[PDB]
Ligand binder design. Structure first.
Ligand SMILES: COCCN(C[C@@H]1CCCN(C2Cc3ccccc3C2)C1)C(=O)c1ccc2ccccc2c1
Ligand SMILES: *[C@@H]1O[C@H](CO)[C@@H](O[C@@H]2O[C@H](CO)[C@@H](O)[C@H](O)[C@H]2NC(C)=O)[C@H](O)[C@H]1NC(C)=O
Ligand SMILES: *[C@@H]1O[C@H](CO)[C@@H](O[C@@H]2O[C@H](CO)[C@@H](O)[C@H](O)[C@H]2NC(C)=O)[C@H](O)[C@H]1NC(C)=O
Ligand SMILES: *[C@@H]1O[C@H](CO)[C@@H](O[C@@H]2O[C@H](CO)[C@@H](O)[C@H](O)[C@H]2NC(C)=O)[C@H](O)[C@H]1NC(C)=O
Ligand SMILES: *[C@@H]1O[C@H](CO[C@@H]2O[C@@H](C)[C@@H](O)[C@@H](O)[C@@H]2O)[C@@H](O)[C@H](O)[C@H]1NC(C)=O
Ligand SMILES: *[C@@H]1O[C@H](CO[C@H]2O[C@@H](C)[C@@H](O)[C@@H](O)[C@@H]2O)[C@@H](O)[C@H](O)[C@H]1NC(C)=O
Ligand SMILES: *[C@@H]1O[C@H](CO)[C@@H](O)[C@H](O)[C@H]1NC(C)=O
Length: 527
């Protein structure tokens, strides 16, 4: 019988068969009192103790969230939809441990993305058993509150303070510190990693003092806090909380009365009004996300970075080649997943209007001008690729590069990667390229499963990324082998070397898309 004694009581797990060996799995361990009733919108409350044995043998409930239903039956979009029931009772975590039991394993903790509005740790692409089997690390992931139930903010008010979903994550990290030794993990060797809003979350734990003693190293995939979507100003957060109150008939004079009113509403009455709390709305809108709450974040994150007030440790950071394309088929004119989506200069200008609602007419011309110096005048698909790159550079790539510069300047080793391989099983059309979120299955080792129809090249690539990721956690260096491997060099603010990741050739290169990013860093803020 697979039983571990945690500080909150005993828990029962299950054995998995993975590549001729065994992986012990504890799925659905609770780490907080269910944020129910009068606990809605509050920070996670600590668990006391249960007598008996909690059965950690199935994934738990996913947190309440809206579902993506733009393309019914389509794997591409539905693979991101939650695969367990939805409920406010959702603060559980998972633990994968190598067999035979380890004695001081390094721990990898996964934080999922989803625009801070969606996502769940139980998706197939986040399965930690491969990493545990192959690289002998412990893998932990947690469900955290997303949307208004996770990030609703009345700053200074303990009844609805902001950043609850971030404290949810933080409490799960506290759980690992207190309990992972019992499973065979080393609490002094803990690495956070995550993608997109998960990577922005990871970069925020770097800034937040309360998290600093709860992990060792950090990995940021396709996200950072300095992204234009990641953080709301204090008062923009409050104005959306008030707008949501108006939409549900919870407008009051007293703040606490507003919250006590919102506490009576059905979760679904809240979910259906989240879209409307912001005038504009682009496919990258974050209705309810992190804000400067005065607690988890004691200042605007760019300030804390600039002043060098963050955790001093090693980071691994990177981005995909086509971060932007995914967002174009959810709004922009002329774009479909069922077309080659070849568009005109006019449609391009409409596309820009969708993504930059508040920008002047001159400003949109600027963007257009910078991204139309064609190598070949036609090339019919020039404009389609231009829009994809505009959205990708501004929202993901250039911020990740800028965060890494600034972070590296305070004396810790950083490593930057450029992921260029398109998955052979990618359900989306080819014109969308190496999409946002489609390096994840390579990081979790899914191509190592030969029963799954991946290419041999893809198993090699995945096995390589897995080795480097796990090695970074253990040694602060993403080496593969000492011999017969490309040296991954540190990212320094002067030379700015990065490593590209694909099946053809992993090369060392410099100043990734500097000509593009120069626009966003040095001209766009002045429009
Ligand atoms: C790697 O994740 C892949 C899926 N995506 C990306 C797709 C992109 C198109 C819109 N999709 C929305 C549409 C919709 C409507 C109702 C419910 C769910 C959804 C999904 C999301 C995310 O999770 C995601 C979502 C939002 C983000 C915001 C800022 C930054 C990154 C973000 C990433
Ligand atoms: C697991 O590994 C850690 C090292 O990361 C061991 O660490 C403590 O490590 C610190 C250094 O960070 C030393 O200063 C302490 O003296 C160590 N304490 C003890 C009791 O050894 C830790 O001991 C290891 N645990 C095992 C092997 O069970
Ligand atoms: C990757 O490089 C690191 C260097 O940082 C190697 O780390 C040492 O690892 C061994 C265990 O194999 C330890 O006994 C040493 O104490 C480590 N030294 C330092 C300075 O970290 C690591 O072995 C390399 N791994 C591979 C597969 O090449
Ligand atoms: C050294 O390691 C490299 C890994 O990069 C090996 O690489 C390739 O070898 C396979 C043969 O199984 C070819 O199919 C690939 O095209 C090679 N990749 C290239 C050339 O980029 C290599 O075989 C190893 N060599 C030695 C001497 O150990
Ligand atoms: C705050 O936002 C206000 C927007 O109000 C709107 O009313 C809500 C209920 C929604 O229906 C929304 O779609 C509407 O746009 C602005 O009028 C106001 O100026 C903003 N104030 C600050 C300080 O940001
Ligand atoms: C957990 O399941 C218990 C029964 O399932 C198991 O009983 C064990 C003795 C062992 O044989 C396992 O292999 C079985 O799967 C049940 O009695 C408990 O009530 C359950 N716990 C809770 C909290 O409901
Ligand atoms: C759990 O795994 C261990 C180690 O492989 C094995 O000895 C034991 O029989 C397993 N228990 C099960 C499958 O209930």
């Amino acid at each position: 019988d697979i039983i571990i004694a945690t500080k909150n009581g005993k828990v029962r797990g299950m054995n998995l068969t993975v590549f001729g060996g065994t992986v012990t799995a504890f799925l659905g361990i609770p780490y907080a009192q269910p944020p129910l009733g009068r606990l809605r919108f509050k920070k996670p409350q600590s668990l006391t103790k249960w007598s008996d044995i909690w059965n950690a043998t199935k994934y738990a409930n996913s947190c309440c969230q809206n579902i993506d239903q733009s393309f019914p039956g389509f794997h591409g979009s539905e693979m991101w939809n939650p695969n367990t029931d939805l409920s406010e009772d959702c603060l559980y975590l998972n633990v994968w441990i190598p067999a035979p039991k380890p004695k001081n394993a390094t721990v990898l903790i996964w934080i999922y993305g989803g625009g801070f509005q969606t996502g769940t740790s139980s998706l197939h692409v986040y399965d930690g058993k491969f990493l545990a089997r192959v690289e002998r690390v412990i893998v932990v992931s947690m469900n955290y509150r997303v949307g208004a139930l996770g990030f609703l903010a009345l700053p200074g008010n303990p009844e609805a303070p902001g950043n609850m979903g971030l404290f949810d994550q933080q409490l799960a990290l506290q759980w690992v510190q207190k309990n992972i030794a019992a499973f065979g993990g080393n609490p002094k060797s803990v690495t956070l990693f995550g993608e997109s809003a998960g990577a922005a979350s990871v970069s925020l734990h770097l800034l937040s003092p309360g998290s600093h003693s709860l992990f060792t190293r950090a990995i940021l995939q396709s996200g950072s806090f300095n992204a234009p979507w990641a953080v709301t100003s204090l008062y923009e957060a409050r104005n959306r909380t008030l707008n949501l109150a108006k939409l549900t008939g919870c407008s009051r004079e007293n703040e606490t009365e507003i919250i006590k009113c919102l506490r009576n509403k059905d979760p679904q009455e809240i979910l259906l009004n989240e879209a409307f709390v912001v005038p504009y709305g682009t496919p990258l809108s974050v209705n309810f996300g992190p804000t400067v709450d005065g607690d988890f974040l004691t200042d605007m994150p760019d300030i804390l970075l600039e002043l060098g007030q963050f955790k001093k440790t090693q980071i691994l950071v990177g981005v995909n080649k086509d971060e932007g394309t995914a967002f174009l088929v959810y709004g922009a004119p002329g774009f479909s997943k069922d077309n080659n989506s070849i568009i005109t200069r006019k449609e391009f200008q409409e596309g820009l209007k969708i993504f930059f609602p508040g920008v002047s007419e001159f400003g949109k011309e600027s963007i257009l001008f910078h991204y139309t110096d064609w190598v070949d005048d036609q090339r019919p698909e020039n404009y389609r690729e231009a829009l994809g790159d505009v959205v990708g550079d501004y929202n993901f790539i250039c911020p990740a590069l800028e965060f890494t510069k600034k972070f590296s300047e305070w004396g810790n080793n950083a490593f930057f990667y450029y992921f260029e391989h398109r998955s052979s099983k990618l359900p989306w059309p080819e014109w969308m390229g190496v999409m946002h979120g489609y390096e994840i299955e390579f990081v979790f080792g899914l191509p190592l499963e030969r029963r799954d129809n991946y290419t041999k090249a893809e198993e090699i690539l995945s096995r390589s990324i897995v080795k480097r990721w796990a090695n970074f956690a253990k040694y602060g260096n993403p080496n593969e082998t000492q011999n017969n491997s490309t040296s991954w060099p540190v990212f320094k603010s002067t030379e700015q070397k990065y490593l590209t990741l694909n099946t053809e050739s992993t090369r060392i290169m410099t100043k990734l898309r500097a000509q593009q990013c120069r626009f966003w860093t040095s001209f766009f803020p002045k429009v």
